[PDB]
Enzyme design. Structure first.
Site, PDB file in Angstrom:
ATOM      1  N   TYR A   1      -0.685  -1.479 -12.285  1.00 54.74           N
ATOM      2  CA  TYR A   1      -0.127  -2.415 -11.639  1.00 54.74           C
ATOM      3  C   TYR A   1      -0.514  -3.787 -12.563  1.00 54.74           C
ATOM      4  O   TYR A   1       0.258  -4.850 -12.642  1.00 54.74           O
ATOM      5  CB  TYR A   1      -0.515  -2.966 -10.465  1.00 54.74           C
TER       6      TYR A   1
ATOM      7  N   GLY B   1       0.614  -5.796 -15.067  1.00 57.71           N
ATOM      8  CA  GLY B   1       1.610  -5.873 -16.220  1.00 57.71           C
ATOM      9  C   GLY B   1       2.929  -5.347 -15.722  1.00 57.71           C
ATOM     10  O   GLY B   1       3.213  -5.180 -14.416  1.00 57.71           O
TER      11      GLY B   1
ATOM     12  N   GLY C   1       5.614  -3.375 -13.991  1.00 54.99           N
ATOM     13  CA  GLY C   1       4.985  -2.062 -13.347  1.00 54.99           C
ATOM     14  C   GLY C   1       5.014  -2.344 -11.650  1.00 54.99           C
ATOM     15  O   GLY C   1       4.411  -3.624 -11.406  1.00 54.99           O
TER      16      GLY C   1
ATOM     17  N   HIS D   1      -2.394  -8.905  -6.167  1.00 54.54           N
ATOM     18  CA  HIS D   1      -1.686  -9.933  -6.771  1.00 54.54           C
ATOM     19  C   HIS D   1      -0.105 -10.036  -6.670  1.00 54.54           C
ATOM     20  O   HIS D   1       0.595 -10.895  -6.282  1.00 54.54           O
ATOM     21  CB  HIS D   1      -1.878 -10.143  -8.318  1.00 54.54           C
ATOM     22  N   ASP D   2       0.349  -8.608  -7.045  1.00 59.56           N
ATOM     23  CA  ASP D   2       1.875  -8.211  -7.130  1.00 59.56           C
ATOM     24  C   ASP D   2       2.352  -8.431  -5.543  1.00 59.56           C
ATOM     25  O   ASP D   2       3.355  -9.026  -5.402  1.00 59.56           O
ATOM     26  CB  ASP D   2       1.704  -6.727  -7.299  1.00 59.56           C
TER      27      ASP D   2
ATOM     28  N   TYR E   1       2.547 -12.236  -4.630  1.00 57.78           N
ATOM     29  CA  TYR E   1       3.653 -12.864  -5.115  1.00 57.78           C
ATOM     30  C   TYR E   1       4.975 -12.214  -4.342  1.00 57.78           C
ATOM     31  O   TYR E   1       6.142 -12.978  -4.164  1.00 57.78           O
ATOM     32  CB  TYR E   1       4.145 -12.295  -6.503  1.00 57.78           C
TER      33      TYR E   1
ATOM     34  N   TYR F   1       2.655 -25.209 -12.064  1.00 56.45           N
ATOM     35  CA  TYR F   1       1.779 -25.593 -11.267  1.00 56.45           C
ATOM     36  C   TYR F   1       0.277 -26.265 -11.604  1.00 56.45           C
ATOM     37  O   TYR F   1       0.298 -26.084 -12.949  1.00 56.45           O
ATOM     38  CB  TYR F   1       1.130 -24.707  -9.940  1.00 56.45           C
TER      39      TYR F   1
ATOM     40  N   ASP G   1      -2.512 -16.664  -8.017  1.00 56.94           N
ATOM     41  CA  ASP G   1      -3.259 -16.674  -9.336  1.00 56.94           C
ATOM     42  C   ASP G   1      -4.640 -16.820  -9.125  1.00 56.94           C
ATOM     43  O   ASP G   1      -5.537 -15.933  -9.796  1.00 56.94           O
ATOM     44  CB  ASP G   1      -2.501 -17.476 -10.035  1.00 56.94           C
TER      45      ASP G   1
HETATM   46  C1  AJM Z   1       8.961  -6.398  -2.944  1.00 57.79           C
HETATM   47  N1  AJM Z   1       9.314  -7.438  -4.175  1.00 57.79           N
HETATM   48  C2  AJM Z   1      10.136  -8.423  -3.811  1.00 57.79           C
HETATM   49  C3  AJM Z   1      11.195  -8.561  -3.021  1.00 57.79           C
HETATM   50  C4  AJM Z   1      11.999  -9.635  -2.813  1.00 57.79           C
HETATM   51  C5  AJM Z   1      11.499 -10.913  -3.604  1.00 57.79           C
HETATM   52  C6  AJM Z   1      10.495 -10.946  -4.454  1.00 57.79           C
HETATM   53  C7  AJM Z   1       9.867  -9.562  -4.624  1.00 57.79           C
HETATM   54  C8  AJM Z   1       8.712  -9.074  -5.516  1.00 57.79           C
HETATM   55  C9  AJM Z   1       9.133  -8.463  -6.753  1.00 57.79           C
HETATM   56  C10 AJM Z   1       7.787  -8.098  -7.101  1.00 57.79           C
HETATM   57  C11 AJM Z   1       6.961  -8.951  -6.879  1.00 57.79           C
HETATM   58  C12 AJM Z   1       5.854  -8.496  -6.487  1.00 57.79           C
HETATM   59  C13 AJM Z   1       5.386  -7.490  -7.408  1.00 57.79           C
HETATM   60  C14 AJM Z   1       6.193  -6.239  -7.169  1.00 57.79           C
HETATM   61  O1  AJM Z   1       5.483  -5.321  -7.808  1.00 57.79           O
HETATM   62  N2  AJM Z   1       7.480  -6.805  -6.612  1.00 57.79           N
HETATM   63  C15 AJM Z   1       7.206  -7.022  -5.138  1.00 57.79           C
HETATM   64  C16 AJM Z   1       6.007  -7.837  -5.094  1.00 57.79           C
HETATM   65  C17 AJM Z   1       8.332  -7.919  -4.717  1.00 57.79           C
HETATM   66  C18 AJM Z   1       7.539  -9.889  -6.005  1.00 57.79           C
HETATM   67  O2  AJM Z   1       7.718 -11.201  -6.528  1.00 57.79           O
END
Ligand code: AJM
Length: 121
Positions: A27, A29, A31, A47-48, A51, A64, A89
């Site tokens: 995860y 990077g 991925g 973190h992923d 976001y 920010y 972050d």
């Molecule tokens: C589901 N997906 C999304 C669905 C709709 C909007 C944004 C996102 C993501 C893409 C991206 C990221 C993280 C990281 C991740 O691996 N992906 C996820 C959560 C998100 C996140 O920002």
């Protein structure tokens, strides 16, 4: 944005986010697949996910401001997106610092096919 995140990491861990955190495990990077390899990789997973809670924000490019009150990270007031991105972050930076002891170079440039599994946020 990546600029604040990278600097936060450096300050917290002493490591350059690139390449220490940008191609680690499954995860950290590019991925988002499989079972996280270790504590550090789990930090990136969370973190992923963090976001992921912000579909209409742009974490990589929205900048920010944050300050340090002695060692503590304090996110400064900005837009709602900026505040929430900063909190994501900050948590990752602390998580990385908390698991430096188990950080393993063997997970750097980890090959994709070894990232197997499902893990929901
Ligand atoms: C589901 N997906 C999304 C669905 C709709 C909007 C944004 C996102 C993501 C893409 C991206 C990221 C993280 C990281 C991740 O691996 N992906 C996820 C959560 C998100 C996140 O920002």
């Amino acid at each position: 944005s990546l600029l604040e995140f990278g600097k936060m990491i450096l300050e917290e861990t002493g490591k350059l986010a690139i390449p220490s955190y940008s191609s680690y495990g499954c995860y950290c990077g590019w991925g988002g697949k499989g079972t996280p390899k270790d504590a550090t990789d789990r930090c990136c997973f969370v973190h992923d996910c963090c976001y992921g809670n912000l579909p209409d924000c742009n974490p990589k490019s929205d900048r920010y401001k944050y300050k340090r009150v002695n060692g503590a990270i304090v996110c400064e007031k900005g837009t709602s997106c900026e505040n929430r991105i900063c909190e994501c972050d900050k948590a990752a930076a602390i998580c990385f610092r908390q698991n430096l002891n188990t950080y393993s170079k063997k997970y750097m440039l980890y090959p994709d096919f070894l990232c197997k599994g499902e893990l929901k946020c």
